[PDB]
Symmetry: C3
Subunit: 462 residues, 3 copies
Amino acid sequence: DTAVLVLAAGPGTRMRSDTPKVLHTLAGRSMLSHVLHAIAKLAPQRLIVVLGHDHQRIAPLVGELADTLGRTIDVALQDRPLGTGHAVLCGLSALPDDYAGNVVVTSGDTPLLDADTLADLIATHRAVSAAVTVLTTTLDDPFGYGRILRTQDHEVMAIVEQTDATPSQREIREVNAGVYAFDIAALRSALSRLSSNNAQQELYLTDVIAILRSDGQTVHASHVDDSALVAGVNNRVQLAELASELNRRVVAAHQLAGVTVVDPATTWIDVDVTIGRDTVIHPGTQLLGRTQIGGRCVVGPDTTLTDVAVGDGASVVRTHGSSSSIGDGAAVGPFTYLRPGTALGADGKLGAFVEVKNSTIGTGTKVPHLTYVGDADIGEYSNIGASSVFVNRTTVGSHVRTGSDTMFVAPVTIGDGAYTGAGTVVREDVPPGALAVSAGPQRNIENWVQRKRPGSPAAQAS
Amino acid sequence: DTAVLVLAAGPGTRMRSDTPKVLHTLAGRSMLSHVLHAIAKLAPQRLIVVLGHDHQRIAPLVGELADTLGRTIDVALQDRPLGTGHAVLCGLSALPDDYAGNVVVTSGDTPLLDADTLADLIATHRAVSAAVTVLTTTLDDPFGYGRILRTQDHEVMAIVEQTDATPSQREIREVNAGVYAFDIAALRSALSRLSSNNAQQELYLTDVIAILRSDGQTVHASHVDDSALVAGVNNRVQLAELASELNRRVVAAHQLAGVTVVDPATTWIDVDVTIGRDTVIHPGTQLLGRTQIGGRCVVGPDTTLTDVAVGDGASVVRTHGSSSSIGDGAAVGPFTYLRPGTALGADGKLGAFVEVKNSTIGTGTKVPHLTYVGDADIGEYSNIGASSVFVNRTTVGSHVRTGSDTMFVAPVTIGDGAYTGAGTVVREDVPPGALAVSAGPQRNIENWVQRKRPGSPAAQAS
Amino acid sequence: DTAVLVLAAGPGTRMRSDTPKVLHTLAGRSMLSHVLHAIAKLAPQRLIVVLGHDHQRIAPLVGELADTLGRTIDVALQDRPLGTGHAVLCGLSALPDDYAGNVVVTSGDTPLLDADTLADLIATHRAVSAAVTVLTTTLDDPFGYGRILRTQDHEVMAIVEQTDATPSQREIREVNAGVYAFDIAALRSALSRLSSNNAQQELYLTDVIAILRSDGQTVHASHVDDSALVAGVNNRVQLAELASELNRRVVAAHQLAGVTVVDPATTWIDVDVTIGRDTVIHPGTQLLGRTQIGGRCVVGPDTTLTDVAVGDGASVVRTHGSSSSIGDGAAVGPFTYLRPGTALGADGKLGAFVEVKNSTIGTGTKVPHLTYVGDADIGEYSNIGASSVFVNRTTVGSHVRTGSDTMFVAPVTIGDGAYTGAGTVVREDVPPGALAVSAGPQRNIENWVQRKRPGSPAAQAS
Ligand SMILES: CC(=O)N[C@H]1[C@@H](OP(=O)(O)OP(=O)(O)OC[C@H]2O[C@@H](n3ccc(=O)[nH]c3=O)[C@H](O)[C@@H]2O)O[C@H](CO)[C@@H](O)[C@@H]1O
Ligand SMILES: CC(=O)N[C@H]1[C@@H](OP(=O)(O)OP(=O)(O)OC[C@H]2O[C@@H](n3ccc(=O)[nH]c3=O)[C@H](O)[C@@H]2O)O[C@H](CO)[C@@H](O)[C@@H]1O
Ligand SMILES: CC(=O)N[C@H]1[C@@H](OP(=O)(O)OP(=O)(O)OC[C@H]2O[C@@H](n3ccc(=O)[nH]c3=O)[C@H](O)[C@@H]2O)O[C@H](CO)[C@@H](O)[C@@H]1O
Ligand SMILES: CC(=O)N[C@H]1[C@@H](OP(=O)(O)O)O[C@H](CO)[C@@H](O)[C@@H]1O
Ligand SMILES: CC(=O)N[C@H]1[C@@H](OP(=O)(O)O)O[C@H](CO)[C@@H](O)[C@@H]1O
Ligand SMILES: CC(=O)N[C@H]1[C@@H](OP(=O)(O)O)O[C@H](CO)[C@@H](O)[C@@H]1O
Ligand SMILES: [Co+2]
Ligand SMILES: [Co+2]
Ligand SMILES: [Co+2]
Ligand SMILES: [Co+2]
Ligand SMILES: [Mg+2]
Ligand SMILES: [Mg+2]
Ligand SMILES: [Mg+2]
């Protein structure tokens, strides 16, 4: 039996942001979302999130996530950010007076923390019958972390915060993860004895360690060797570092499953994205949101896709696209913009300098050059000429061949197998197999240039 | 006298690919190509490649490479992938029964291995009269490598594979490169004594080390300090790591020879690419295949060129281009697509949102905006107006000035010094110094807006 | 009282460049500019730059910088590059014979050196009454640096250059920064005793250390723990390394002040660039020159801006732009090119495949697709149709709606609230609230396709 509390009520001042800290994102989820996902998977009996000043703007998001994960998640309010020890006091208040399970505590700013790490913590805590078990790790750069103080016998004595530590204690590289398990009665007892006489004038959860040690209670540290899993984020430098570590891991998972990723460092892949076997992803690419790529695709370089579905054997090269689907074998890019509601059929082509918005494009249809397609439905095996505009519904049939520089003034229907001539402005329906035209005939004005541009390079050349 | 065997007949299952492992690429060559290049340079008397199941799809590539490098390269077949010791047995069978030279063995998945490392190995082997000499290195992360076992006296005892090693042996950081020299008679003798009773149930080449030691034969390890040269690739994570290490080295070679590379980490340069002095390469750039850049060019950011020749003092900025030539002083980009067969003369310009395919563009000619040029030949000092389409042969002369929004309906010829008006559809030849036109005259419809868009922001503004 | 000499007269041969070494750039300033900025801030009584062969091409730049920093900076000439000891002799000659202040020496190729490091040096020098104080640091890779030689008692004995050091001395990791303070009389004395009998046959400033030690003078090393501040650049590999270190620092400063930078490694930010709170910068972005970004902007991915001003709450996505302004709330990109003199009003939009040059675009005006706008002034709340060309002054009023595929043949004026039809060539003024047109009427040719493309997929479909 376990209750997990998530401390998410600090001001977040070191982020320097008007967006609450725990709402900042990496890999397509907010830090609080990452932490709640890992905990839902652990499936404890209770899950409490302590919220503070910005609670109006965070609580609804927590309720959406409770729905999403199919479990209830309570919110305890912490009126003023008096310290992590005080946040835990506020959290405990959402539990019955007589609750008797373990209490696990973690921060909203430790977003790589995973279900396994949490499980192992609870198992260690129970195995050594500890009044408190604290996760620790060891870091080349421990700046900002509580330092682990040990006796000569390697027994944990205390946690000292970066603001309170001596120059000498600051060299300690073993750090507090800020992830704990507690005996409830011992935790309640230690919290009632915290005082705020320290360099931040705050009630430190970390003092509970020396307090329980005081009482001769069992204090156990558990060393997490993979430091990333328990790394924290207090500012945007640390946010981008952990986002980059998490992104290397996501990419590695894909590479081990069969995806070529030419340059992991410049390939950003959100956590829910799936990618098929033998796809090759070229440098400078972001795959975001619920993007799904099939097998044997080529993607990038310099492509950004957010919520885009791509079939098998497609090419999507230098493409900026969102909320769109791209069929098997289709070719998109280079220099192609897909706006929401774009559906391109199998073996379709959208070429260079083409933008599509809210349009359906049938199997085998090509829009290869300098064209805008908006609010239109186009059939199968059609060909849209270069430098054209769908001026915006318009329906174009199958096996149509439209000429370069055609404007389609919505709404108009072009029948199956119809053609338009180059330079046509289409303002009315075109029957199946008809040719629509409107450009006037060419006229040559002889020797114009000698007359109107006399002594010019063009005049001398003629 | 030396025979080199290349073991390339394993299944490659950890790549998770339908393309044989040794055919995966980095820096524009397959791993097997890299390994055969380094060995051809060493120029041994014999060169044998052991191939397995996918031999149908690899052997032809080996024959093309034998042709390319001007030497014969035999292929020995290994029916079933029974282990590296068994692959070497299959390899030896392509040698005469009575062969008496040294036998060098290396893997197809060690692609940074170079001629010098191989030479030094053979020199060390001969100098210490070893029955076997094995290349080793030392690594922070030795996962997956055979560990070097040494006695108290630093004498090499054995090689233990990652699957077979104790937790304690796994901490050993000195690893087997999988590159060896052998006395032939000792190698034949040791191979006939391998058994497959180990964690992979395979015949391990690595066991030969403890077997020859058994017989009191001389076993010598040679430490390669530059670990990269002997790094292996068993999966796509390791492939991208070694591709990135190799790319840093290629870029560094260019920087030391006089190329500014603003961001090595995001500049990918294939091994055959040459680049002239005082060129500056901006971030996000890939130079691929047989690309050649002259001196004092500016290239990037975000440019990909495959098989592109660029003269001296050209600019090629945000350009995606292949199999094309760009003359001295020419300017291309930003946002420019070159398809195969593009030839742009000296001081030519191809601007933003211009795509060219299979066209010749003469000295000093500019195509600056939103235009497609396909299957066309254009002369010197001409100017193609914005938003135009070559609708596809068409020949345009020198000193021509064509107006914006001209469609050139192939095939048509435009004489030297000719003009077209804006909005012209050109369907017939235009004489030298003539002006071709087809747009109708402008008509203004007064107060249309008050009538047809009454109470609109446009109506109120008028 | 202090004189600072900057040695900038070496040939720079290891750069392999026709641009003098000290003129190569990182983060938008030349190395010599970086070094002179840091020294001006220290504000010593005298500032002397020693220049050599390329002095004609460097001295004017030094005079511009003296003006910029509001102080005089003398130039001493060093006829032939006889060595750093000889450069300092040439430098001293720009001082009075009887000068009595401290002499600080530094290189033009140490460009992260900052005012604080210099101040601390002078303070240490004066505090220990040293005849010479040398800055040192310690490096994993000390290749190319003079090695610090110490006695058993940790007293500094000598500096040995990489070319002159034994294999064993080469393992020394503590290096000479090439930054010194001197007693003037001791420096003059030691310089007159240098000889050039060493591996480079040069007069080494570094020998002065062992010479003053010889005379029983006080020699003090001061260890700089942040090695970057004193790192040198002798070749383009080292230039890009230090440019990348400096760029991480600039980005970090922005992240700590409130800027989200998703990928520091692929975000390049020049030193004078300012960026507002809660802006998000996406990967592959360069912000160059005097670029200024306001708050809550979104910038990138793949955007390059040089000297661009962007208001608050704007979006500038996949944009290549220079010397332009973008108003509050405006939207630019993806795939947008801004050339110098572009001014886009608040809430304006420049869309995909749009290039603007030397044009003013008023509040709320949209140019969303495939258009070139050159040398034009456009009013407020207007809408420019897709695939249009300003053929280049032209003035367009407010609340205008122009139709797709309009060519505006400069110079023309379009009144407030005017419209043009799709496919119009505008060659004369259009009154306020008028509609201008020129395209001919559509004609459908029935069954053309069965007649002219018989048995085609289009013919069968009809
Ligand atoms: C005193 C303390 O605990 N310090 C720990 C805290 O430092 P650190 O300084 O990171 O602690 P923070 O200021 O980030 O606050 C901890 C978390 O608890 C929440 N919160 C904070 C204050 C408050 O009054 N109410 C509240 O709910 C915040 O949402 C925050 O996410 O985590 C580090 C690891 O990341 C540990 O090494 C430190 O030992
Ligand atoms: C038992 C053995 O040798 N292990 C070595 C092998 O491990 P490793 O596990 O990498 O060996 P692999 O499975 O990659 O096979 C070695 C190479 O030989 C070829 N091959 C393999 C099996 C086979 O039955 N037939 C065949 O021809 C494959 O093409 C492969 O490229 O290389 C490592 C370095 O990269 C060394 O540290 C290991 O000591
Ligand atoms: C002999 C000497 O001093 N070596 C130092 C020099 O090596 P390093 O080999 O880098 O010295 P350089 O060749 O770069 O020359 C030093 C600087 O002085 C100027 N210059 C050089 C030669 C000359 O004849 N005239 C002249 O004015 C150059 O502009 C150059 O920027 O800096 C290193 C750190 O960067 C130190 O570790 C070395 O101890
Ligand atoms: C071809 C065309 O007329 N496109 C229009 C059209 O673009 P959308 O792609 O629907 O957002 O509506 C816009 C007004 O929202 C206007 O700015 C633009 O000119
Ligand atoms: C200006 C023009 O008509 N371009 C054509 C033309 O492009 P290419 O660039 O030749 O591949 O042929 C294509 C059919 O292969 C067609 O899809 C496209 O519309
Ligand atoms: C729409 C138009 O006619 N643009 C012209 C025009 O471009 P600028 O953007 O002004 O540089 O002048 C150029 C001659 O300098 C010519 O190459 C091009 O065709
Ligand atoms: Co924190
Ligand atoms: Co291997
Ligand atoms: Co130097
Ligand atoms: Co037109
Ligand atoms: Mg704080
Ligand atoms: Mg295996
Ligand atoms: Mg030198």
